[PDB]
Short mmCIF file of all heavy atoms in Angstrom, two decimals:
data_model
loop_
_atom_site.label_atom_id
_atom_site.label_comp_id
_atom_site.label_asym_id
_atom_site.label_seq_id
_atom_site.Cartn_x
_atom_site.Cartn_y
_atom_site.Cartn_z
N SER C 17 22.45 -12.16 27.19
CA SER C 17 23.52 -12.34 28.09
C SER C 17 23.03 -12.57 29.56
O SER C 17 23.77 -13.01 30.43
CB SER C 17 24.50 -11.17 28.14
OG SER C 17 24.94 -10.96 26.82
N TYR C 18 21.75 -12.19 29.91
CA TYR C 18 21.18 -12.57 31.13
C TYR C 18 20.75 -13.98 31.13
O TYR C 18 20.80 -14.71 32.18
CB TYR C 18 19.97 -11.65 31.39
CG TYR C 18 19.61 -11.54 32.92
CD1 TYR C 18 20.44 -10.82 33.80
CD2 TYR C 18 18.51 -12.17 33.54
CE1 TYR C 18 20.11 -10.68 35.16
CE2 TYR C 18 18.14 -12.04 34.81
CZ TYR C 18 19.03 -11.35 35.61
OH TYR C 18 18.74 -11.18 36.98
N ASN C 22 26.51 -18.07 34.29
CA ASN C 22 26.90 -19.01 35.27
C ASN C 22 25.77 -19.07 36.32
O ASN C 22 25.04 -18.16 36.54
CB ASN C 22 28.20 -18.51 35.96
CG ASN C 22 28.15 -17.49 36.88
OD1 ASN C 22 27.52 -16.44 36.61
ND2 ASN C 22 28.62 -17.64 38.11
N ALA C 25 24.89 -16.80 40.28
CA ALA C 25 25.34 -15.39 40.47
C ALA C 25 24.25 -14.44 39.85
O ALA C 25 23.43 -14.81 39.03
CB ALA C 25 26.63 -15.15 39.80
N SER C 40 23.99 15.04 26.00
CA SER C 40 23.38 13.79 25.42
C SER C 40 24.48 12.76 25.44
O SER C 40 25.37 12.85 24.58
CB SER C 40 22.97 13.97 23.98
OG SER C 40 24.08 14.09 23.15
N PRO C 50 32.42 -12.19 32.24
CA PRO C 50 32.14 -12.89 33.57
C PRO C 50 32.91 -12.30 34.69
O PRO C 50 33.76 -11.38 34.51
CB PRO C 50 32.62 -14.37 33.30
CG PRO C 50 33.76 -14.14 32.48
CD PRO C 50 33.52 -12.94 31.57
N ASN C 67 40.59 -5.97 27.45
CA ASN C 67 40.82 -6.75 26.16
C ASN C 67 39.62 -6.48 25.20
O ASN C 67 39.77 -6.22 24.02
CB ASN C 67 40.88 -8.26 26.46
CG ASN C 67 41.58 -8.98 25.33
OD1 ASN C 67 42.47 -8.45 24.66
ND2 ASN C 67 41.17 -10.23 25.11
N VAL C 75 37.48 -2.66 15.67
CA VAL C 75 36.30 -2.37 14.87
C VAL C 75 36.10 -0.88 14.51
O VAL C 75 35.87 -0.57 13.39
CB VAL C 75 35.00 -2.89 15.59
CG1 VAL C 75 33.79 -2.83 14.67
CG2 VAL C 75 35.21 -4.31 16.09
N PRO C 77 37.93 3.19 16.11
CA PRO C 77 38.71 3.89 17.09
C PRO C 77 37.86 4.98 17.85
O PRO C 77 38.30 5.45 18.85
CB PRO C 77 39.83 4.50 16.30
CG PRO C 77 39.21 4.85 15.01
CD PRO C 77 38.23 3.64 14.68
N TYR C 102 36.64 1.80 37.63
CA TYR C 102 36.67 2.38 36.35
C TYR C 102 36.95 3.93 36.35
O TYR C 102 37.01 4.53 35.25
CB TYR C 102 35.33 2.08 35.59
CG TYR C 102 35.22 0.64 35.12
CD1 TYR C 102 34.56 -0.30 35.95
CD2 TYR C 102 35.76 0.25 33.91
CE1 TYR C 102 34.46 -1.66 35.46
CE2 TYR C 102 35.63 -1.08 33.47
CZ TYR C 102 34.99 -1.99 34.31
OH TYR C 102 34.93 -3.28 33.74
N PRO C 109 31.84 7.61 35.16
CA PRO C 109 31.26 6.39 34.58
C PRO C 109 29.77 6.42 34.66
O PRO C 109 29.15 6.60 35.73
CB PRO C 109 31.84 5.23 35.46
CG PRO C 109 32.83 5.91 36.41
CD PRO C 109 32.35 7.31 36.49
N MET C 133 33.16 13.29 47.24
CA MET C 133 34.40 13.74 47.83
C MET C 133 34.46 13.26 49.25
O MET C 133 33.53 12.68 49.85
CB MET C 133 34.56 15.25 47.76
CG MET C 133 33.41 16.02 48.37
SD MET C 133 33.83 17.39 49.41
CE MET C 133 34.53 16.62 50.83
N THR C 145 24.05 9.38 42.10
CA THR C 145 23.37 10.54 41.46
C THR C 145 22.74 10.06 40.22
O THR C 145 23.42 9.76 39.23
CB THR C 145 24.39 11.62 41.20
OG1 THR C 145 25.07 12.05 42.42
CG2 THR C 145 23.68 12.85 40.55
N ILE C 159 12.91 1.04 10.90
CA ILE C 159 12.21 0.15 10.00
C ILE C 159 12.62 -1.35 10.26
O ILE C 159 11.92 -2.25 9.91
CB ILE C 159 12.48 0.58 8.56
CG1 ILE C 159 11.28 0.09 7.67
CG2 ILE C 159 13.83 0.04 8.02
CD1 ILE C 159 10.90 0.98 6.50
N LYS C 166 6.82 -7.51 15.65
CA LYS C 166 5.72 -8.46 15.34
C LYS C 166 5.89 -9.80 15.93
O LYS C 166 5.05 -10.75 15.73
CB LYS C 166 5.57 -8.58 13.84
CG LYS C 166 4.12 -8.69 13.29
CD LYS C 166 3.09 -7.73 13.91
CE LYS C 166 3.37 -6.22 13.62
NZ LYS C 166 2.68 -5.41 14.62
N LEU C 195 -8.05 3.66 11.78
CA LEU C 195 -9.28 4.45 11.43
C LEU C 195 -10.36 4.13 12.42
O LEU C 195 -11.22 5.01 12.66
CB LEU C 195 -9.75 4.04 10.05
CG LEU C 195 -9.08 4.56 8.80
CD1 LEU C 195 -9.80 4.08 7.56
CD2 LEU C 195 -9.13 6.09 8.84
N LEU C 199 -12.93 7.00 14.46
CA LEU C 199 -14.38 6.94 14.01
C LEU C 199 -15.31 6.48 15.10
O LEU C 199 -16.50 6.90 15.15
CB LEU C 199 -14.48 5.96 12.85
CG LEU C 199 -13.94 6.52 11.42
CD1 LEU C 199 -14.59 5.63 10.32
CD2 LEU C 199 -14.29 7.95 11.21
N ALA C 202 -15.80 9.30 16.93
CA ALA C 202 -16.50 10.33 16.11
C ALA C 202 -18.03 10.32 16.39
O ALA C 202 -18.64 11.33 16.48
CB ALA C 202 -16.18 10.23 14.69
N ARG C 218 -8.87 20.18 16.84
CA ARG C 218 -7.83 20.79 16.06
C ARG C 218 -7.03 19.78 15.32
O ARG C 218 -6.51 20.03 14.16
CB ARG C 218 -6.83 21.56 16.96
CG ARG C 218 -7.40 22.83 17.61
CD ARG C 218 -8.21 23.68 16.50
NE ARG C 218 -9.18 24.52 17.16
CZ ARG C 218 -10.12 25.28 16.55
NH1 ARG C 218 -10.14 25.26 15.13
NH2 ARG C 218 -10.95 26.09 17.17
N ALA C 253 11.41 -6.69 -18.10
CA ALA C 253 12.36 -7.54 -17.37
C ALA C 253 12.06 -9.06 -17.71
O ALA C 253 13.03 -9.81 -17.73
CB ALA C 253 12.15 -7.33 -15.84
N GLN C 257 14.61 -11.55 -19.32
CA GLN C 257 14.95 -12.77 -18.63
C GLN C 257 14.61 -14.05 -19.40
O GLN C 257 15.23 -15.06 -19.33
CB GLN C 257 14.26 -12.80 -17.20
CG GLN C 257 14.62 -13.98 -16.33
CD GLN C 257 16.09 -14.32 -16.11
OE1 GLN C 257 16.61 -15.23 -16.72
NE2 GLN C 257 16.74 -13.64 -15.18
N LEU C 262 16.62 -18.16 -22.76
CA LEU C 262 16.78 -18.76 -24.09
C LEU C 262 18.16 -18.61 -24.61
O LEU C 262 18.61 -19.42 -25.47
CB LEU C 262 15.74 -18.26 -25.06
CG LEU C 262 14.35 -18.89 -24.82
CD1 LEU C 262 13.24 -18.28 -25.73
CD2 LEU C 262 14.46 -20.39 -25.11
#
Side-chain angles (χ1 to χ4, degrees):
Chain C
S17 309
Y18 204 74
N22 76 309
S40 75
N67 203 33
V75 189
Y102 288 94
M133 55 136 290
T145 301
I159 206 146
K166 214 48 64 202
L195 280 184
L199 286 199
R218 288 318 155 185
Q257 182 53 261
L262 280 172

